[PDB]
Amino acid sequence: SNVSADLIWEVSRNYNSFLVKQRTGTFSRDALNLTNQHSRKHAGFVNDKALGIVPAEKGVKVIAKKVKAANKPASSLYTVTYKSTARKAYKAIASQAAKHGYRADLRQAAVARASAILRSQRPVKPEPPKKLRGAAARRAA
Amino acid sequence: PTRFSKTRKHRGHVSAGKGRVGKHRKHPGGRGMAGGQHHHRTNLDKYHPGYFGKVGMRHFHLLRNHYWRPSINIDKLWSLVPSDVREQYLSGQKKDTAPVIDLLSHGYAKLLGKGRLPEIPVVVRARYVSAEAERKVKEAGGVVELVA
Amino acid sequence: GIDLRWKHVRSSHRKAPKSDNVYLKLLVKLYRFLARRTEAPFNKVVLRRLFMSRINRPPVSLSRIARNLKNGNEKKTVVVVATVTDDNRLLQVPKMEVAALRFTAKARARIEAAGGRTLTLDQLALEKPTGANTLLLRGPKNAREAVKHFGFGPHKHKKPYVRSKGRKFERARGRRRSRGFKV
Amino acid sequence: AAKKHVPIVKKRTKRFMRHQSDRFKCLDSAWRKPKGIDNRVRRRFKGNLAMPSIGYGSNKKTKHMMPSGHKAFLVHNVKDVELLLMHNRTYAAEIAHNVSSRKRIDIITRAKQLGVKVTNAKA
Amino acid sequence: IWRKWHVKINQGQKRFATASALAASAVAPLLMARGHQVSTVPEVPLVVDSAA
RNA sequence: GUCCCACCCAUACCCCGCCCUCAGGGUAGAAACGAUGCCCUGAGGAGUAGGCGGCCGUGGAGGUCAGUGACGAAGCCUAGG
RNA sequence: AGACUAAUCGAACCAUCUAGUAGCUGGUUACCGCCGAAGUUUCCCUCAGGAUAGCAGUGUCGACCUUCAGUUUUAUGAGGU
RNA sequence: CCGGGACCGAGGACCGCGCUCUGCAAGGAUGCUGGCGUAAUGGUCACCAGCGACCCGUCUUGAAACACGGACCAAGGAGUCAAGGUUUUGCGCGAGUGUUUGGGUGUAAAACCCGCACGCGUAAUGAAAGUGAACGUAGGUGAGAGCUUCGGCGCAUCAUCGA
RNA sequence: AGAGACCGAUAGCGCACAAGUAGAGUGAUCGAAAGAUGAAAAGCACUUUGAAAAGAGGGUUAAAUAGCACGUGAAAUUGUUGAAAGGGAAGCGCUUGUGACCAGACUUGCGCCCGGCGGAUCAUCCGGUGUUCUCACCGGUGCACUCCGCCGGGCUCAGGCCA
Ligand SMILES: [Mg+2]
Ligand SMILES: [Mg+2]
Ligand SMILES: [Mg+2]
Ligand SMILES: [Mg+2]
Ligand SMILES: [Mg+2]
Ligand SMILES: [Mg+2]
Ligand SMILES: [Mg+2]
Ligand SMILES: [Mg+2]
Ligand SMILES: [Mg+2]
Ligand SMILES: [Mg+2]
Ligand SMILES: [Mg+2]
Ligand SMILES: [Mg+2]
Ligand SMILES: [Mg+2]
Ligand SMILES: [Mg+2]
Ligand SMILES: [Mg+2]
Ligand SMILES: [Mg+2]
Ligand SMILES: [Mg+2]
Ligand SMILES: [Mg+2]
Ligand SMILES: [Mg+2]
Ligand SMILES: [Mg+2]
Ligand SMILES: [Mg+2]
Ligand SMILES: [Mg+2]
Ligand SMILES: [Mg+2]
Ligand SMILES: [Mg+2]
Ligand SMILES: [Mg+2]
Ligand SMILES: [Mg+2]
Ligand SMILES: [Mg+2]
Ligand SMILES: [Mg+2]
Ligand SMILES: [Mg+2]
Ligand SMILES: [Mg+2]
Ligand SMILES: [Mg+2]
Ligand SMILES: [Mg+2]
Ligand SMILES: [Mg+2]
Ligand SMILES: [Mg+2]
Ligand SMILES: [Mg+2]
Ligand SMILES: [Mg+2]
Ligand SMILES: [Mg+2]
Ligand SMILES: [Mg+2]
Ligand SMILES: [Mg+2]
Ligand SMILES: [Mg+2]
Ligand SMILES: [Mg+2]
Ligand SMILES: [Mg+2]
Ligand SMILES: [Mg+2]
Ligand SMILES: [Mg+2]
Ligand SMILES: [Mg+2]
Ligand SMILES: [Mg+2]
Ligand SMILES: [Mg+2]
Ligand SMILES: [Mg+2]
Ligand SMILES: [Mg+2]
Ligand SMILES: [Mg+2]
Ligand SMILES: [Mg+2]
Ligand SMILES: [Mg+2]
């Protein structure tokens, strides 16, 4: 055939609508891109098998590409929400990524993304008051 | 496009790549083909031997149509037959019929004899024919006939 | 100081294709892997020829293939990293298996009609990853109109740059003894 | 805290000021390579301004790194700052100058949630 | 005014480009990478009954 | 004038770090990669005229960022980063 | 008196041909990286200029072939300082 | 074989050469401890100090020149475009190739479609009349990448003798 | 009459304005500069000082440092204020010092034990869906020698600057 993951990467390597390039780095805002980096490894929209993790209301929501529905986008994503426990979510995501050979190279990235989202969903601590060093004398008067 | 040109790279460099001693003046050496038998003679003799002088006789009011006689070789003679019929002849499904080729209809006037011919009879109608082409057609078993 | 005649000398050969063809890039990746992971010099030669410009990949005709198919080469697979064209002068196309960068429509049709086989270079890599039983062919590099003009000079019999051909165009004084001298 | 990294070395802190820009107001201080035939700076006379060279290039490990060890990433909204979710130890968000105050507050709140350092958070 | 405003393109190359664009239009990743919202599209070469 | 000892320092020499250039290798039954990437090793760096490469900036056009903005765009000033 | 002919006269003023031609003078606009000269040959109403070869850059290609060398050695010629 | 001093610590799981072999000074710094946790370190600016430092551009063998231009500032300001040619890139098709003079059509200067002729190429040579390209598996010799059944087959290209 | 990958008030026609105008020349001819308050003049009533121009109050406005010298308002150049240096130039490079003024970093985070508080899944099993067909999700069960979170104490590890 004329179309493959390598061909799609060849045609989308230099520019695509998900690319965000600037000094100090080039990122990708693709939904199926763990680490949000621009590379064949993580450009999930070009690969037949890919994973994406987004925040849920209380846990994480994981989408995986279904290989048989690559031409049917409305039914091309297998979605599952994990809102029980951080460790159970990690276990399920790691199984999803490695047990059946579905992008085993993305296991660490997917677990780290789930951990980062769950950490962000925690309450934030208030910032300590900011001290003054040169403004202290001028504002003390 | 202007952004790919070397003038953009010469910005900030005085003399724009034309040198400081030689300065890109207007026309040193003259315009066009000035000095062909002089300062430019070295070039006009190294390249273009035969630039100067006359050779041969004149033809007032030359009408190019008088000399129209495009030529085709016998090696491409069989390419004038349609591909299916040509394949039938080459494989041998006829051997009782001969193809008659109208070179003038195909746009040719003279038949030349560069290539080889398969041993298949073929009638060729041509205004002109070379001796070798005629001999080769006859040996292949056909004939050439003059048609004007 | 180190007193060197040459410093920072760059390699004079191509290291990648100047083309932006995506399929050519994929083919180059495939043959880079093959040339790295195999001992066959065939793979390295094919990889280097995949970088080459079009004038460095002159076309090969069916008649040129037929010439080299003789003398014990009939069952070898013909490999041409170039375009394979047809030849009207060849009336009978021999049965042949050819892997080429591309084929013209007539060349492909005649090869298939003669009982032969047409392959791409990735198919060739699949069936013969080491290039075994292959016949690697190149087209005529110098058979080009521009080359006829190269190196023009006295007593070199090259083609001059003229706007037209005729008695009035570069044929007098420098080309015959009746007009001073000949070349 | 940023990722462990080798100490940051600059090799130079001065700006490579243009020749005679200190004497002529028509000359901006931005560096220009002197092309003059007699130019002492071009000929590298002792005691003159230095010309920039590739030898001054910073270490590849610490290039584009602010003293805290982070690389600046310019963000214009919350969705932009969310791109740094997996990079809170290597990248710090810098809010664009033309961002409104409410959007700045939203970006700062989201960056606090994500643990991403903001270089220009105070306002 | 006699600047070369228009560009002559081979018809064969025009037809290749058109065919290549048509082929690319059938690849779902390419639509998203070009910025189309096709997450709810039932099938990438989306065909609607001509009776509609 | 001759002979001897110690010492001073060049952008030279030696050792080390870093930048770039050039060169030579590794990297897929892919747990895979801005393969235009990464990893390993060696050497080299003056330059007018001039050549080539890569990049920065400006006016306008197509696509895209579901981009920024009267809760303040652009511009301008700034011994603040 | 080459004087005067509207402050203009060894050929007035105005507009146009006209952006007249100049081998001559002046100028010719961001950065970094790599390479890097010549003022010599032959011809030219040639001598403040050209073409021509040389020196230079870039792009390649060829098996980069086991050859190449501003060097020494050995053997063997020439020269008239 | 013993001291005394200086500068430096690149790399980052293991892998290797090894030794004085439960370990080691053997393919690159660790261990212990103290003060401070802020303008203390550090950066920027102004000034003093030590050493260094001629005015740029240009022509030129040679410029800081008693060589020329430059009082200062803002804005403007100089290798463009067309035709023709050439070589080298990238493309499409390929013994062919080129739709767009024109016609058809159109959501109307776009896009799409069509073909007769024509240009270039497919044959050269001679002033011209004119003639016009295979003895050979399209030749022999020496090389020649790559294949090889290991006996040779020999691309491109070069030199050479032939047709 | 319709358009533009055109120009945008030193540009674009010489002319975006009472521009072929003002002005110059006997004349033929030559020939400029010059756009922008504000949404709306609401274009500053009134008091006071002054001969007046104006100033100071006051008023209009979202805004008067938008006041017909009117959007923004650069540089050259100038005034005041503050700091500093200066024995026939100054500027500048390397390097400290002083003074002034500052950006960061830090003020924690990980784990492991011992108590307190809260919750209901924590394993397992059953059923239904999904899926990469063995990995999950959703319901039912669980029901406190589980699981999760928040406080309090102790310990461990890492983490800033100068030594
Ligand atoms: Mg230069
Ligand atoms: Mg000049
Ligand atoms: Mg000269
Ligand atoms: Mg010249
Ligand atoms: Mg050196
Ligand atoms: Mg001779
Ligand atoms: Mg005679
Ligand atoms: Mg004569
Ligand atoms: Mg700096
Ligand atoms: Mg000089
Ligand atoms: Mg070095
Ligand atoms: Mg250099
Ligand atoms: Mg413009
Ligand atoms: Mg603003
Ligand atoms: Mg007289
Ligand atoms: Mg008069
Ligand atoms: Mg008079
Ligand atoms: Mg007169
Ligand atoms: Mg006049
Ligand atoms: Mg050099
Ligand atoms: Mg003469
Ligand atoms: Mg001169
Ligand atoms: Mg003598
Ligand atoms: Mg003598
Ligand atoms: Mg300090
Ligand atoms: Mg000083
Ligand atoms: Mg001095
Ligand atoms: Mg002189
Ligand atoms: Mg000078
Ligand atoms: Mg003097
Ligand atoms: Mg002079
Ligand atoms: Mg002069
Ligand atoms: Mg002057
Ligand atoms: Mg302007
Ligand atoms: Mg300007
Ligand atoms: Mg041209
Ligand atoms: Mg034709
Ligand atoms: Mg003829
Ligand atoms: Mg061999
Ligand atoms: Mg105007
Ligand atoms: Mg004006
Ligand atoms: Mg005007
Ligand atoms: Mg008048
Ligand atoms: Mg105004
Ligand atoms: Mg007011
Ligand atoms: Mg104001
Ligand atoms: Mg205002
Ligand atoms: Mg104003
Ligand atoms: Mg000022
Ligand atoms: Mg001085
Ligand atoms: Mg200091
Ligand atoms: Mg359950």
Answer yes or no: are the C-beta atoms of A26 and D87 closer than 8 Å.
no
The Cα C55–Cα C18 span in angstroms is 13
Q: Which nucleotide is nearest to A95 (CA to C1')?
A: I135
Return the biggest CA–CA distance within chain E.
51
A12, closest residue in chain C (CA to CA): C22
Amino acid at C91: L
Residues 16-75 of A with CB under 7 A from strand I: 51, 64, 66-68, 75
Alpha-carbon distances of A84 from A99, A110, A123, rounded to whole Å: 21, 17, 18
Minimum-distance CB partner of D64 among A24, A124, A130: A24
Q: Rounded to the nearest whole angstrom, what is the distance from the C-alpha of residue E5 to the centroid of ligand 31?
A: 49
Cβ-Cβ pairs closer than 8 A, A with E, add up to 50
User: 3-class SS at D7?
Assistant: coil
Angle between helix C22-37 and helix A5-12 axes, rounded to 10 deg = 120
Task: Note the CA–C1' distance, C162 to H119, in angstroms.
Answer: 18
- First CA to last CA distance, chain E: 49
Answer yes or no: are the C-beta atoms of A96 and A64 closer than 8 Å.
yes
User: Is any Cβ of chain C less than 8 angstroms from the Cβ of A3?
Assistant: no
Answer yes or no: are the C-beta atoms of A45 and A65 closer than 8 Å.
no
The Cα A111–Cα A92 span in angstroms is 9
D38 is in an annotated binding site: yes
Chain E interface residues (partner A, CB cutoff 8 A): 23-24, 26-30, 32-35, 38-45
Please give the resolution of this entry in Å, rounded to 1 decimal.
2.2
Give every strand in the sheet of A77-82, ordered side by side: A51-55, A60-65, A77-82
The Cα D90–Cα D72 span in angstroms is 9
Cβ-Cβ pairs closer than 8 A, B with C, add up to 57
The Cα B39–Cα B32 span in angstroms is 13
Statement: the CB of A78 is under 7 Å from strand I: yes
> Nearest bound ligand to CA B2?
13
The Cα C30–Cα C33 span in angstroms is 5
- Nearest CA among A70, A52, A72 for reference residue A117: A52
Chains C and A touch (3+ CB pairs under 8 A): yes
Helices then strands (H, E): number in chain C? Answer: 5, 5
Give the side-chain half-sphere CA count within 13 A for D16.
12
User: Is any Cβ of chain A less than 8 angstroms from the Cβ of D4?
Assistant: no
Paired with A81 in beta bridges are: A61
Q: Which nucleotide is nearest to C172 (CA to C1')?
A: H127
CA A1 vs. chain centroid, Å, equals 30
Minimum-distance CB partner of E42 among A3, A12, A72: A72
Which residues have C-beta under 5 Å from ligand 4, the single-atom ion?
B 22
Q: Annotate B29-89 with DSSP letters as a single string.
A: T-STTTTTTTTTHHHHHHSSTT-SS--S---TT--GGGG---EEETTTTGGGS-HHHHHHH
Å from C165 to nearest chain B CA?
13
The Cα D6–Cα D69 span in angstroms is 9
Q: Annotate D24-70 with DSSP letters as a single string.
A: -TTS-SS------TT-TTTTT-TTSPPPP-GGGPPPTTTTTB-TTSP
Return the DSSP state at C182: B
The technique is cryo-EM
Amino acid at E2: W
Task: Note the CA–C1' distance, A132 to H35, in angstroms.
Answer: 23
Alpha-carbon distances of C35 from A7, C40, C53, C78, rounded to whole Å: 21, 7, 20, 19
Q: Annotate E1-52 with DSSP letters as a single string.
A: --S--S----HHHHHHHHHHHHHHTT-HHHHHHHT---TT-S-SS----TT-
CB contact under 8 A, E42 and A16: no
Q: Considering only CB atoms, which chain B residues are within 8 Å of C153?
A: 46-47
The Cα A35–Cα A20 span in angstroms is 13
- Nearest CA among C60, C126, C54, C52 for reference residue C96: C60
User: Is any Cβ of chain A less than 8 angstroms from the Cβ of D66?
Assistant: no
Give the side-chain half-sphere CA count within 13 A for C90.
19
The strand pair at D71-75 and D91-95 is best described as parallel
Q: Rounded to the nearest whole angstrom, what is the distance from the C-alpha of residue D32 to the centroid of ligand 32?
A: 28
Statement: the CB of A139 is under 7 Å from strand I: no
